[PDB]
Amino acid sequence: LDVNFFDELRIGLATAEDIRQWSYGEVKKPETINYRTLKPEKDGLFC
């Protein structure tokens, strides 16, 4: 639990390496969720 005493807030430009170090997996499909079961499709925007 953060004790809320930050010294500085810095911006830079994200390197594609940074963008990949953030990511937990590539989204590959445009589907969101199945209409039948309302469940999030694999590799989709809500995977």
């Binding site: 830079g12 430009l13 994200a14 390197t15 594609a16 963008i19 990949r20 953030w22 990511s23 989204v27 590959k28 499909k29 445009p30 969101t32 969720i33 309302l38 925007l45 809500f46």
Partner: protein, 195 residues
Amino acid sequence: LVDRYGEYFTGAMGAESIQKLIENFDIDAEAESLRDVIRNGKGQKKLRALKRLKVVAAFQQSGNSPMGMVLDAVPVIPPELRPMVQLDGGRFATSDLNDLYRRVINRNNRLKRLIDLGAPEIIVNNEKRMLQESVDALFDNGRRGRPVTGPGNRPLKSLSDLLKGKQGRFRQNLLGKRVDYSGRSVIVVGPQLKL
């Protein structure tokens, strides 16, 4: 120029070309040149040089490279921050962000399909420009050309819009909030009170 002399140079279109330029770009060399133009020049040349030097010196004084200005990979915001909810009527409501990411995905996948199929260079260039424009929408819709629209002709609020104006996160959710332990009602006079 390519049929003859094609093996004496490299040329190309698009962001890949801009990336190759930024690669071969010597920040120290151009920075020294701009400092020279500022020190020994005058008039409009001096003004333009100071303008360009702000960018160049900023990129060299900080250790971050200008390559970051060209993306090979696009991040994707967590899905709770772009929710999707079912409504009365069996219809759904999605944040505009999902339609924008979805167009980016469709165009990237169609580009991959074309590249695998060895499509004509004109069609693959069409798909590359389309991918570029869809990422332009995802980042800041309407800044260049026609805004991507949803039903009823409304421009899809992009990741830039999420921050601007009294609607954006700053003025709507960080400089003022909705709070608990609070209420509201009509006021009447009640002269019997003490101050």
